[PDB]
Structure formats: structure tokens, C-alpha cells
Amino acid sequence: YDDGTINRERSVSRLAAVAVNYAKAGAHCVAPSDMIDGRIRDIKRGLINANLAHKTFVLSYAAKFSGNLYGPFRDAACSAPSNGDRKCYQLPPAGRGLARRALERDMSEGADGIIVKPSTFYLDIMRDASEICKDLPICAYHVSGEYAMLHAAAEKGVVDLKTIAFESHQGFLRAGARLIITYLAPEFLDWLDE
Amino acid sequence: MHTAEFLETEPTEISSVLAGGYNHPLLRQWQSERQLTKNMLIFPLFISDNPDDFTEIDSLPNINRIGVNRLKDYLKPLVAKGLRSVILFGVPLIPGTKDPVGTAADDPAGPVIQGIKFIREYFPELYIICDVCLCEYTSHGHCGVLYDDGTINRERSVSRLAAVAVNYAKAGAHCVAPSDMIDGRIRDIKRGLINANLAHKTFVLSYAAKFSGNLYGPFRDAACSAPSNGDRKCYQLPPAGRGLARRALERDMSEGADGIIVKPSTFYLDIMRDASEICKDLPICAYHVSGEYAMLHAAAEKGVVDLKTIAFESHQGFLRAGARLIITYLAPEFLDWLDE
Amino acid sequence: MHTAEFLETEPTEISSVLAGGYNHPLLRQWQSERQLTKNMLIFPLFISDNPDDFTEIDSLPNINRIGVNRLKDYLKPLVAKGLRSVILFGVPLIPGTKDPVGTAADDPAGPVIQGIKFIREYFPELYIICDVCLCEYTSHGHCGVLYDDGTINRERSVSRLAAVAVNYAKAGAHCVAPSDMIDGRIRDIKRGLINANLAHKTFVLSYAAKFSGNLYGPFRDAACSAPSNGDRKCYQLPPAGRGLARRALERDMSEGADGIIVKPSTFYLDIMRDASEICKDLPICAYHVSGEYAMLHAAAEKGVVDLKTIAFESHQGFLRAGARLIITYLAPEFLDWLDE
Amino acid sequence: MHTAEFLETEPTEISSVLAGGYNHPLLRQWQSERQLTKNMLIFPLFISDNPDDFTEIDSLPNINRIGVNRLKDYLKPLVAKGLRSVILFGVPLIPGTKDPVGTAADDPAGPVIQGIKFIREYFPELYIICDVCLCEYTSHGHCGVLYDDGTINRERSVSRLAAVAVNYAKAGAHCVAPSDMIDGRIRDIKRGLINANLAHKTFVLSYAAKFSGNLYGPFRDAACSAPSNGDRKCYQLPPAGRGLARRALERDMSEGADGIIVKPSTFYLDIMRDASEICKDLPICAYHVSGEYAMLHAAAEKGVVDLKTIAFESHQGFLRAGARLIITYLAPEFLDWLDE
Numbered sequence A: 001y002d003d004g005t006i007n008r009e010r011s012v013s014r015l016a017a018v019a020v021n022y023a024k025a026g027a028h029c030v031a032p033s034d035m036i037d038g039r040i041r042d043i044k045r046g047l048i049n050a051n052l053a054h055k056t057f058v059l060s061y062a063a064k065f066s067g068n069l070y071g072p073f074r075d076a077a078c079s080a081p082s083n084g085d086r087k088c089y090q091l092p093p094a095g096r097g098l099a100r101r102a103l104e105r106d107m108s109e110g111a112d113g114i115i116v117k118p119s120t121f122y123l124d125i126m127r128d129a130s131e132i133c134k135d136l137p138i139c140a141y142h143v144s145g146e147y148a149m150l151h152a153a154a155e156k157g158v159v160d161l162k163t164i165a166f167e168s169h170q171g172f173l174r175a176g177a178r179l180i181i182t183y184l185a186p187e188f189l190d191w192l193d194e
Numbered sequence B, C, D: 001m002h003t004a005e006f007l008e009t010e011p012t013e014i015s016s017v018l019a020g021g022y023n024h025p026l027l028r029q030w031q032s033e034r035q036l037t038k039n040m041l042i043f044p045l046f047i048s049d050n051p052d053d054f055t056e057i058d059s060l061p062n063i064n065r066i067g068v069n070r071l072k073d074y075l076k077p078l079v080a081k082g083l084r085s086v087i088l089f090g091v092p093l094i095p096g097t098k099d100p101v102g103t104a105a106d107d108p109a110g111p112v113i114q115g116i117k118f119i120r121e122y123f124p125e126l127y128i129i130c131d132v133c134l135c136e137y138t139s140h141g142h143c144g145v146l147y148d149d150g151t152i153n154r155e156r157s158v159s160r161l162a163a164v165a166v167n168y169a170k171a172g173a174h175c176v177a178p179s180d181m182i183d184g185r186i187r188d189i190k191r192g193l194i195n196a197n198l199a200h201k202t203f204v205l206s207y208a209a210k211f212s213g214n215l216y217g218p219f220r221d222a223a224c225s226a227p228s229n230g231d232r233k234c235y236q237l238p239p240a241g242r243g244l245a246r247r248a249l250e251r252d253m254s255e256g257a258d259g260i261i262v263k264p265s266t267f268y269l270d271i272m273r274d275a276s277e278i279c280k281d282l283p284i285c286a287y288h289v290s291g292e293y294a295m296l297h298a299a300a301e302k303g304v305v306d307l308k309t310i311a312f313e314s315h316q317g318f319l320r321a322g323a324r325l326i327i328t329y330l331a332p333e334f335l336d337w338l339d340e
């Protein structure tokens, strides 16, 4: 909006277009990560009208929280909320009630799956999701801050990288996830073999 | 030209609109099921049998091993800042003090009981929790009395444990927190307290869901006791074992726990949630373990995160998952922050 | 002309649209609550008291009766392909070896215990499960000690059974799987293991929901023992009895089962689901029975189905219904397939 | 000597004792939540456009393709034995009769509608169910109208389907059973029936949970139509997909299904159970598929099982899992057996 807060209507309108265009280009799955109210509905409707809903997985970041764990990401995809705070749309860390409502909402609006982000620090929300979205695949996102915290701790000798990597990621599966987005995927491609 | 495309959309459904509930700073407080207060905080104390002790524990940043004559000067600022509870771990370093049956566990001249008498005299408003285990007192560093083969002897171990716990309560501990994970020990501790006419005044805070893992590093570097010859996995639950943790939670509640501890904490938030449903009528306590505590200190130092920010995030995480109590090495920092 | 008519319809409701979730090969993997892995597989072994045995079991395609000196050569390829667990059935063929009280059940020179010692020595990474029953050892071919009239004697039977199970664990079995279905036997087996100081290391895997039926054909043709004079229906549950199976499941869990077996499997998938709710905190195991296994081999041979396709369909069926373990005669084929 | 050992045991706990409930033949009837009756049975009919047809369907033992002038002589013994319901599948073999949009589906001179008029006139006590799909009528053998690329066109397909279903009801079908699995088709069929003033008298029996698999073999060998160029997996649910089946069940109920079909049956008993909870207020119907039916015939012939025994076991299995209806090719045998 002219004031700087977010314009729901024009934003979701813009977002649905992008998602559809990614699917037109050949993406199998779109994962909206904006957290703007009602965007999954408009993305699903957009895919329907484009005759792509029958082949596009909508993987919503349904429970995405504000926090101190996104550090390295901004240092990669170069984009950190200049002038403002992404807390008026990311949920507050203490807000379990809102996350539960956001989970039911995205499922009801057409999500085929949901992402919980960050992961370790939100395992209880993953569990909540496993009950509310029991018929849907749940995906854990091990965020750059969580990933950097493990690398740092190991380097300092607090823990062993591979041990704490398997512990944290088995932690996702214990809490209800059956999918994991992780920067340690290349190491896991190796380890799971042996 | 590639121009910005905008799809036609439907009017907003009311059911979509959540942001009305967290647009303002005070609303993100409204949205919390429990808010962090000072009396929620339990600070662990490692008591040495050298009474003039004050030794830095290598891998436990800003945490030390302290003897009785250094205790009042260390605990006075904290109690005057709002500290309400301590959890005691004894670290007897005198040679000859460890033995097969963990005899020194309840030695009246031992660090724990002396620590109990100290605090009871000089800080009688302080709530005293005592860890109950043999690992700190055994020659082999395990949490119970072994069989000749080296596995654990359930019967003799719980028999030994109940004695210790009762003795800690006799000495004046308000709360006993058994951390051994040996099957059925809460029953025998409760029965022991009953027969000693102390059950009506002793809180039994069970480490009901305690997991094996890579997060206990600095602790062993403090209370000097890491499972020589063997692995504490045959009694600590496997990290993937949600089913066993749920069963262990129902068991300890049914055996008399007044409260339960989930340990470690951040990495087991889903188990805390499980506990909040199964043990809904009981206080649930999070233990932020030395490995978790050291991981945060390390990450901050490296610039990955801000210590105080991630400390508040992690600990509010405990409250979100169902805990209303927190055992944490960051209690002294939180005594400061909660004021401002 | 008859032309193709098309009714006017409403815009698509989002609530109608599911295909977004399974349009791609990797999504049909995403959609599974559990994926089939190699360590899920338990392969049954029939051990003969003739140590040089290797006899084809007529009605059990590609499955044989093997003695101790033929075991290492038979199990070596499998363990090196990923086999992690075996379930042992003894087949004593020596005359004079069967008797009223099933004495040979725990004979230290008997096929089971000798099989246990063999595997423990030459394959110490293998997890050993022992079937626990008397039917293979009794003169009359029934699963417990009878009354003079021929019905089963609960007390003496469970007394006899607990002894056998404990003896198998003494000999080194990691897991005992009682398959008799006699009321209360899990309690007495657990108590027996407790008193022998073996409960802390022995998995009790109860055949909690075992049904009467037409699917056990080849088994009797292997372990030579089909209910002479009588019917095993007065202890196996009736196929229509869902209520009894549910009660039997709660009972065995409450009596100490660490896991439960549902048998047969395909034809009882709804009971597996029932078990997944009642015994939600316990591992559930599917037993693909010799009749089910022979039915698939027969159907394929006749061209009704493809063996490997229907094998993966049936066994993924177990995982869908709640099982995370499978006892199956197709384990050797699955050791191969899961690789590719 | 190795003697039979017997452990000391505790008195019997009442909670252990279940056998009091199934010791007698009439009790295994008491124990059933539903008993199999004759009016539960629905027999499929394959109607050819050659009215003098009576051709054996290779892979469907004792089942044939029949034209209108052979129908009364074939259905008379059955109706007089207790048959109450039929499910019609048309098999138009005349050249030029298949086409892109499945025009022949609701051809008034087509086998289905002619079959409807036949039965309505000569067997007006018979309840008529019509399969609703395009696969039997399309040039490419798929269950809906395709996009140029070959995937399925949801809108035009459901539009085409609703027309067919309504037309079957106009012709006098009592029940329509859509088997295409295309998202949202039940809504449009119900709306179509409403607008035609037929919803008050037409049962909509949805194939809500229909899975991909290896069990449909003989069917394609009967109704001649197997997915040329492609795979019916992008609309049939994956076998491992319990979550999708549960969602599909809630969807079809919410869209107006009066009943639901689970197909295949034995191999999906856990889904039947799921359905019994989600669609608890609706009749649930089991479809024993041609592959399942052929597998039983094959297994019996090979001696693995007894046909009638395993037929009663499997079909009582449907009732145990929650079904109160069964579509089965063994209906004629069951008309006989249920009498004795």
C-alpha cells in the first residue's frame, strides 16, 4: 500500500500469476512462501482456470514463523526486508493458535501439502500439523540459520555434525514430517548408503 | 516487454483473514498461551565436595562447579533478582568416594545434602530440587547398579535410587527429580516417600521422557561422569521412539509423578506437545541441556544468531509446546531481561 | 442421430480437486505413510533336527526345511543382501520326540535352540525371533496342554509356554513370539522373563490377533503338525469376530506385549488398521501366511497377476494399514527388488 | 534327561479370559457385527450389443457376455433363488460405435439402456445399478474426455458423465455408480439428477475409493477396454495413498453420494474400515474384482485353498470391515450356499 503495509488483493493477484506461470513453464510443484492471507485459494483457482491443477502440487508454507533463523538465506537470495519488518505476515513464534488456524485454512483452500518452517525450533507445530493435516504430506524446512547453527556448533566441538544432523532430521520424521527440505541433502545422499 | 501479470480474483473470504489478530506488539503477547515469568525458571547448581570450589566447566559457558563456602555469594544476587528454584547436582571429587553401589549419593557430608542444608539455612525462600541418580557416584559412571555382565540391575538399582531420593527429602529437599530412566523407579520412589511420611510434602518431578543423543556434552564435562565401558542407550529412549516416550509418560504419571521433565528440549518439542496432552493435568518442565545451551552460545559467537533473541525464541518455544517450567543455564540472563 | 450430450456445470470447487497430489511418480511415494525398507523384513526359517537337511516343503514354493549344517550357506547371501531378522520354527522329525506336554519344545539339543546358538555364533548381527508354541512338539498337534476331554488346559499350557519362551531367551533369542492364542499367556511369559532377569532385553511379540481360516495350508505341510483329532477354532478367533480381536489386542498390550502380530495379513487388513489405533504406541507386524503366499504364486502362474507387482501391492498394503514390520516368505525376492 | 519345565503362575485374571465368548458354533455367529444375507449381493452383468450373445470371458471363470434375448433365461433361476440386484456393464462390439466423446454410452439402442428396459419389463422386482463411465465407449479406452495432450479433461468429462448418468436414470435405472474417479464428478451427477427431477429416486453409489493395481485383469478381458496409450493411474488412487482415499471418501459424501464402493476389496480391507468411520451413516459396498475372483479360483484349482471356504472367508471379511453390500461374481454360488 502507499503506506508500506502489504496490499492483500494486488499481492495475491500477482502471486497467483507467478505460480501459474511457473507451472506453465514446467514446474511440478509450487510452494508459496509469502504468508499473505488467502493466497492459496487464488493460486489454486488460477491453476484450475489454466487447466494445470490436475498436475501441479501446491505445497503451502502454511506455518511460517518470524524469528532469528533466516540469516544465511538473505545472504544468498539477497533480499532482507528493507524499511520494515516481515512480522506483520510471518506468524509470531508464540502464536500456536494462529498457526493451527493457518494450517486448517491452507488445507481448506487447496494445499496438497504443507511446509513447517523453521523446523527443529518448531517441532511442536509439526506435530500439530500431523493431526490437523493428517491426510496430507508434511514437509520440514531446515532453515539456513538452523543449518548454520549446526555447522558452527560442530566446528566448536559442541556436537558431531553427522550425529546431530541425523538426530535433528530424524526429529522431523518423529514429529510427523515425511518430507525434508535441507541443505544437508548432499551429505545425506552419501550417509544413507552406509 | 515482459509485464507484471495479475489474475482476476474472487472477493476475500472472511475465513482467509488472520492478520487482524497479530498486527500490533501487544497482540503477539495476546497470542501466547503462556507468558514467560521469572518463577518459571529453575537454575542448576553443580556442588563440589571442595567447599572453596569455583571452577569453570570447560564446555559450559559461564557455568561453574561451586563448593558450600562460595554458594551464598553466588546465589545472593540471583535470589534478589527473582530466582525462585534450584536443581542440585553433586560433583564429589575426593578419591575413594565412588563405588559400585553409589554409596556417596546420599552421604550426609556429601555435596548434595550439604548444599541442601546450606540453602535451607541461608535462602529459606528458595525451592530446592535434587537430581536423583547414581551416575555421579558410581565407579563405572552408569545410572544404576549393574549385573555382573554390565547391563543394569533393575531391582537393586531402583531400590538404591528410592533410598537416595527419600534421604534427599529427609535432609530437606522440596523436590526430587529422578533422571536414571530405569523402568518403574517412580513407583518405588513414591512408595518410599509414603513409608517415610514425606509424600505429602515432596514433589516428584520425573524425567519421564529423556532421550539418548549428542546434546549432553558439557554436562559430562561438569559433573564428571560419562558412561565408561558401555552406552546409556539401553535405558535412555531412542530419539525416533515416539511410541516409547508416550508410554513412558503415561507410566510415570500413573506411578505417581507430580510433574514431568522432557529432556533435551528444543530438539524434542514435539514430545513436549505429546506430554501436554497425555499429562495435561500435570506441570511440564523443559530442560535446555548443556549441548543445546552450548550450541546457542557457539552460533551467536559465530554470528549465525543473536544470543538474547534466539534465547527468547527457544524458551518461548518451550511454553508454546506446553511447558510451564524451564530448567535452564540461561536463568541468570533471563533474570535480567524479564525486567526490561 | 444420437449425439453426445453434455450438461451445463458449475465452476470447479477447489474442495473437489485431489489429483494435484499424485500426478508424478515421486508423488505416489510422497503419499505413502510408510515406505518399504529392507530392515522391515523378517524371514521365517524351518529348522529340522536332521542337521544335513534341505527338503522342499511341498506346498511352500521355494521354501525348505533346513538343518544346522546347511544354515550358513543358505543365510549368507541373504544377510549380505540386507536381511536383518529371522523367525525360527523347529521341525523335530526324530521318532519319540513328541509327547503330551511338548517336552522337546525347549530341548537344548533341539532344532530351535541349536538354530539359536548357530546364528548367534555365525551371524551375530541377525535379530532372532522364536515362535513359541507346543503344536510342533505335541503328540496330538495342538498348541497347549489338554484336559482329559481334549479341550485345552489354560493353566498348565501357559505354564508350559512361559517356560519355553524363557528358555529360548536364555539360549539367546532376542525376541519371543507366542502363537498359541491361549488366554493370558502373555502375562505369564512376561512375568517369567522378569523373574529370569531377561525382560529388559527380550522383545515380546504377541500374535494378538490370530484368526481361524483356510490360509495355513502349506505351513502344516512344512512344520508337520495339523490339529489331529479336533479343531484349533476354540482358541483361534473366528474370522467375523472383530470385537474379540479388538479385546485380544488390548489384552496382550496390557499384559506386556512389546509388539503385536496380525495373522493372516491381506485378508485381515481391517484388523491391522484396528490394531494401529488400539496399539498405536507399539510396532505392528504383518504375517503373510503360507496360504496367502501360495495363492499369489498360484495366481501368477495362471496368469491372473504378475508375481512381483502383486507382491509389492500386497506388502505395501500392510504398510498402508498400519504395519511397520512384515514376516514374509517373499523376503529373499524383496532383498533383490528393493535395491532396484 | 531334558524334562518338561513348568513355571509357577498367578491365578487367572478375569481380564485375560475371552474364550467364553466363542466356544460354540452359534457363538461365532453372535460375534459377527453383520451376517451375510442374500439381498446384500449384487451380481454384475455384461451386456453385448449382439442380442443373441453368450460368450465366455476368457479370464472370468463362469462369467459371460450376454445379449438381450439371452437375458431372461439366464436371470430367471437367479431371481428365483433370491437375487435382488444387478450392476450393468455394456459391451458394444459393433464397429464404428466407439468415439472420442463416448457417444454410445447413453445410446438408447445401446446394450445398457436396452438391458435396462429388458429387466424393467421382465424382472420388475430386480434393483438395477448402472456403472457410469466412458472407458467402454471411447476410442482410446479411458474413463473421460481427453485434452489434446492425452491427459484427462475434467470439465468436459464430468459434463459428459453427468449426462450419461441422468440418461440411465431416465431410462429406468434405480442406481448409478460412477467409476471414473474424476475429481468432482459426483457433484455434477447429483446436480444433473436434481435438475431432471430424478434425485428423489436415484441412488448415487460412488466408487469413492478406487485404486490402481494388478487386480483388474479379467474385467478388461470382458468389457474389452484397457487403457490404450497411457495409464489410468493419474486418476485411480495409488495403492499406498490412504490420505487421498480418506479425502476422496469425504469429498464424494459431501458431493451427494448415497453410498460408496471400495474397490478392490480384500486387498483394501483397511480402506473399507476407514470408510466405515468416515461414511458411517452411509451404506458401504465391497467390490470383489475380477482379479481377486480369478485369484481365488486359481488358488483352489491348485489346491492351496477350498473355493467355498475361502469365498465365505473373504466375503465375511467385507462385512467385518464395515460393508453391508457386496458386488461379486460369486453371487450365483452364494445364492445356493446361503440356503444350506
Ligand SMILES: *[C@H](CCCCCC(=O)O)CCC(=O)O
Residues within 6 Å of the ligand: A033, A069, A070, A071, A072, A073, A074, A086, A117, A141, A142, A143, A144, A145
Ligand atoms: C523464503 C522461503 C523459505 C525460507 C528460507 C529458508 C532458509 O534457507 O533460510 C522466505 C523466508 C524469509 O526470508 O522470510
Ligand SMILES: *[C@H](CCCCCC(=O)O)CCC(=O)O
Residues within 6 Å of the ligand: B131, B179, B215, B216, B217, B218, B219, B220, B232, B263, B287, B288, B289, B290, B291
Ligand atoms: C543428567 C540429568 C539431566 C540431564 C543433564 C542436562 C545437561 O545439562 O546436559 C543425566 C544426563 C546424562 O548425562 O545422561
Ligand SMILES: *[C@H](CCCCCC(=O)O)CCC(=O)O
Residues within 6 Å of the ligand: C131, C179, C215, C216, C217, C218, C219, C220, C232, C263, C287, C288, C289, C290, C291
Ligand atoms: C503357526 C504360527 C504362525 C502362523 C503360520 C504362518 C504360515 O506360514 O502359514 C501356528 C499357525 C497354525 O498352524 O495354526
Ligand SMILES: *[C@H](CCCCCC(=O)O)CCC(=O)O
Residues within 6 Å of the ligand: D131, D179, D215, D216, D217, D218, D219, D220, D232, D263, D287, D288, D289, D290, D291
Ligand atoms: C470398471 C469399474 C469397476 C471395476 C471392475 C471390477 C472388475 O470386475 O474387475 C473400471 C475399472 C477399470 O478397469 O479401471
Ligand SMILES: [Zn+2]
Residues within 6 Å of the ligand: B133, B134, B135, B136, B142, B143, B179, B180
Ligand atoms: Zn544418571
Ligand SMILES: [Zn+2]
Residues within 6 Å of the ligand: C133, C134, C135, C136, C142, C143, C179, C180
Ligand atoms: Zn501353535
Ligand SMILES: [Zn+2]
Residues within 6 Å of the ligand: D133, D134, D135, D136, D142, D143, D179, D180
Ligand atoms: Zn472407466
